[PDB]
Ligand binder design. Structure first.
Ligand code: 5KZ
Ligand code: ZN
Length: 257
């Protein structure tokens, strides 16, 4: 089915997922001069001290680290959110070249990659129910630029050789997602959607202003993954990003001045 190639990529998705042309699709371009400071936004509360990572997995469209979300162990609160959102997984989107790869853009600037920390609203009980709700998910988005290495990313990078192809996974315990966060929690926020099918319009996006820097050797290691399963022709998992979607009847709010 859907993918990121010429014949099954983002321009094709609306045929199977008509919400792709909906009113609150993600990602978007963040026009920094049009985003309005909202002094009523609360500071984000990122509570990751008890996070329990489980597995790392190549799912054919990205690579993800999954966590135990059967208790309130790693939760996102505050900011624009009401209630408690549990961390389910994080994954990345990246490019074939350093000048592209992010899904959100900032004043039309593309970053080399973008990290998504995916959380779901505990009042809906499970993630399958949350994805059917307008406020079911909160995704924390962090941009990646190429420069110095990010030490907290290295333990991820070092196991990617063991999940090269679609359907491979590995034990990934005791990983601390706090090592992937930039210093500042200043953020932009809007109502949006999943950026992969089914593109459900269930996401409060929280996109951090400050990117993290990763090294060229770290991102090169992303680009060695494969979309295909083993035994199928090899096609490099690169450019697994959806481009910016029309903003339509939405305002992006900034938590900073
Ligand atoms: C390919 C497709 O159409 O859906 C792919 C999977 O989607 C995930 S999802 O709707 O929960 N998406 C996974 C989490 C999205 C995180 C947000 O991503 S981003 N890039 O916007 O941070 C769904 O899982 C849930 C809980 O709804 C699907 O449903 C099931 C029953 O597993 C679906 O799996 C299948 C076989 O359809
Ligand atoms: Zn994503």
């Amino acid at each position: 089915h859907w993918g990121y190639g010429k014949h099954n990529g983002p321009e094709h998705w609306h045929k199977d997922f008509p919400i792709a042309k909906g009113e609150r699709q993600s990602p978007v371009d963040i026009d920094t001069h049009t985003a309005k400071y909202d002094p009523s936004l609360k500071p984000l509360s990122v509570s990751y001290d008890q996070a329990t990572s489980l597995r790392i997995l190549n799912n054919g469209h990205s690579f993800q680290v999954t966590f135990d979300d059967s208790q309130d162990k790693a939760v996102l609160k505050g900011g624009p959110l009401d209630g408690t959102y549990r961390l389910l997984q994080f994954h990345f989107h990246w490019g074939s070249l350093d000048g592209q790869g992010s899904e959100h853009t900032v004043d039309k600037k593309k970053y080399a990659a973008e990290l998504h920390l995916v959380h779901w609203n505990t009042k809906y009980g499970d993630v399958g129910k949350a994805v059917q709700q307008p406020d079911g998910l909160a995704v924390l988005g962090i941009f990646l630029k190429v420069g110095s290495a990010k030490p907290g990313l290295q333990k991820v990078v070092d196991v990617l050789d063991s999940i090269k192809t679609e359907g491979k996974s590995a034990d990934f315990t005791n990983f601390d997602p706090r090592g992937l966060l930039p210093e500042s929690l200043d953020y932009w926020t809007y109502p949006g959607s999943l950026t992969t099918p089914p593109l459900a319009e269930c996401v409060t996006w929280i996109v951090l202003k400050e990117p993290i820097s990763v090294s060229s050797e770290q991102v090169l290691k992303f680009r060695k993954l494969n979309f295909n399963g083993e035994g199928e022709p090899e096609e490099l998992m690169v450019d697994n990003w959806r481009p910016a979607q029309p903003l339509k009847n939405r305002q992006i709010k900034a938590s900073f001045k």
